[PDB]
Amino acid sequence: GEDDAEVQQECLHKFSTRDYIMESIFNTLKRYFQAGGSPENVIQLLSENYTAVAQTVNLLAEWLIQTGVEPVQVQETVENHLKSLLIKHFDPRKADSIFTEEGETPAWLEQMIAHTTWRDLFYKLAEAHPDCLMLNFTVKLISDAITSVSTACQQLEVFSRVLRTSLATILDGGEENLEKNLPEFAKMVCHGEHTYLFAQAMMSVLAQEEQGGSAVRRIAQEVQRFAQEKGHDASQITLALGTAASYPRACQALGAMLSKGALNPADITVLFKMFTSMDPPPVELIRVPAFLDLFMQSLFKPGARINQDHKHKYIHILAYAASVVETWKKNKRVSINKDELKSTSKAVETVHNLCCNENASELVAELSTLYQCIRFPVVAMGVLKWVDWTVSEPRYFQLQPVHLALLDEISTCHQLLHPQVLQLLVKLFETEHSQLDVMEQLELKKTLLDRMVHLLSRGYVLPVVSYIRKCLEKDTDISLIRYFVTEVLDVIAPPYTSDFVQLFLPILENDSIADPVTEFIAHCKS
Amino acid sequence: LQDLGVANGEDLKETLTNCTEPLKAIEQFQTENGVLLPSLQSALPFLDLHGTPRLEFHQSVFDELRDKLLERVSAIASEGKAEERYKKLEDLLEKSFSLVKMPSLQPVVMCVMKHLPKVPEKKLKLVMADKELYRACAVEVKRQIWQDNQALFGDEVSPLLKQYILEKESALFSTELSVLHNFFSPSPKTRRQGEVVQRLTRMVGKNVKLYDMVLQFLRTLFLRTRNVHYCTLRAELLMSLHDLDVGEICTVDPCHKFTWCLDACIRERFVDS
């Protein structure tokens, strides 16, 4: 039958309800006027319940602006309200319907994207929807202005172009901006094993270049680390890519160890017999970062399972990894130095014995041999992981901290361990205990600040002051920054290069005392 | 709306009546009475497409922005330099009293009148004249009319005093006898808990002129009735002012200390040493 008796009431519900005149009112009005009936009382029903909420808002908003309160507060409040209503009431089906009625969204979308909050709205909408056509199109086009990983790896050509551009940005990033340039690429590579294998092979071929391919090899190892973080075993990838195929025993042994993410006396025994033979396989073959991290966590956490007949075998293989010089005569190992092996293995043995014994005062007893033996780099790393796991225990500072002293030997005597030590202390500078009060937390923080200022004195100055600026802008109270400046200007000698001033002085604007601060500011601005 | 130069519904129907292009006139009226930000004039069709009318986000921001306006009325009462803050509140009063007739800006203006010690009395006169304003008006608005003229004070204390005598007569004539309790068991502070004298204290607040007014009106009825009820109500009003720790009456009244002593006397029902 005719739908007038029902559809006219459907439209009259939206007419005679409180306050609907300002809308789909045109569509329902057209349906009613084509359906006939009483169109004159429809307009009266629309305007009867017109409460004039809009002019009420005019009065209220212009009165808040009269009050001298910032109108940008009103802008933020309205934007937050409407954006939250959208997110709560967003329908992906209706987004795909907007795509269906026309492929490119009309100018309302291109007007919203000018607003940063709406761009973030589209980001949160589309980062979770890898099949909604409007959302996928918006995220991809905004990337053309996150590139969604599903449309990143949907084909070779898109993945390759975004890969090479992102890798260009990583290489442009030097040694700092990679933290932002690598994940967008790495998570793009870490979605499937075929995009993964293609990427790892391209970086392997690129790494053969002696004009910086070492950095491409570094980035490939980092991507493999991330692929492990996504729970995917790239052991056989590194095997068949590297020189594992040259030695099947080392291949299966190392590959099993990497696939588990743990060691074992069996594969270790295989490598021990190989490097005990007159033809030791390449030392580059075992020199893998995660593998050597397995050595650290076997030899320097409490435990693990260990036999004395294999303890020395683990130690000797790590010494071979850290010591032996193989000279390539066109990729031919012809000279094998093993003369700095026994001392390294002895130091590793003694330091590992101290570390698994769960040492404090006994550390100070044998600190002489320790600072004698931290000169070995691998030993310095082993002690670093040991003191990290001991000190990372919750409330390890209420009971002896001598451990923080040892970094002074490490970072001072090994330049390339500056990034680790600060990247250790960044956790320790965020220590918080309810037992050790905020006073003791601030003492420990100031001690760590003295350590970080010493590490700055060794040349690691850009990331130190950058992180100090960041956590002041966040966490770190003004007292800690003032103590930082006190110790710094008490220790650092002029001249002060502008690369250090550019971050140290515009954060020192908050304070003016520790007077050495006045001298520093006057010298560095003049 | 015309008080500050804005149109009303009759002007809208004039804009529609006898027009060859009523639709464009309606659109022009909508443009003239919209919220004036540049982002909205494009977003209004888009948000209208959802099935959400423009009035709905207007309602949300209406609640939010009048809440902040009331917050800022209280702030400017308590914030800013004195001349500037009172100038701001009086100017906002002149803006807002045109819409006290509307259902939005009554209590905002009532707070503004609450936080000014004195006002041009035309608006206080309208507050008493109109029953809706006579209800919703804040306490100090009523105090200002009473402090400026005693008509409303007498008009409202007469029924309250009639109710007090109603309570006295009804309680004194009640037909219960027991070893358990009688009607003289409550102490005077027990009897002050009734809303009659407490609301009378609210009506007086901390003002001495209204104290003199209640004193005189109780004096007149005590002189005509020969009844101790109005005496008791003066005592209750004084000690309810003391219950609020009203220093404006308690420290200046020589009777306050003595009635406070009499309160303990009545509580024990003896005058101990």
Identify the overall geometry of chain B.
elongated
Q: For the report, how would you describe the main beta sheet of chain A?
A: 2 strands, antiparallel
The biggest beta sheet of chain B, please?
A: none
Number of strands of chain B: 0
Q: How big a fraction of the residues of chain A is strand?
A: under 5%
Question: Termini of chain B, distance in Å?
Answer: 70 Å
Dominant shape of chain A: extended
Tell me the Rg of chain A in angstroms: 33 Å
Largest interface: A-B, 33 and 42 residues
Q: C-alpha Rg of chain B, in Å? A: 27 Å
Strand order of the largest sheet of chain A: 1-2
Number of helices of chain A: 31
Supply the number of helical segments of chain B: 16
Q: Got a strand count of chain A?
A: 2
Question: What structural category arises from helix and sheet content of chain B?
Answer: mainly alpha
Helix content of chain B: 55-70%
| Subunit arrangement of the protein | part of a larger assembly
Which percent range fits the helix content of chain A?
55-70%
Keywords (chain A): Nucleus, Repressor, RNA-binding, Transcription, Transcription regulation
Protein name (chain A): Negative elongation factor C/D
Organism (chain A): Homo sapiens (Human)
Subcellular location (chain A): Nucleus
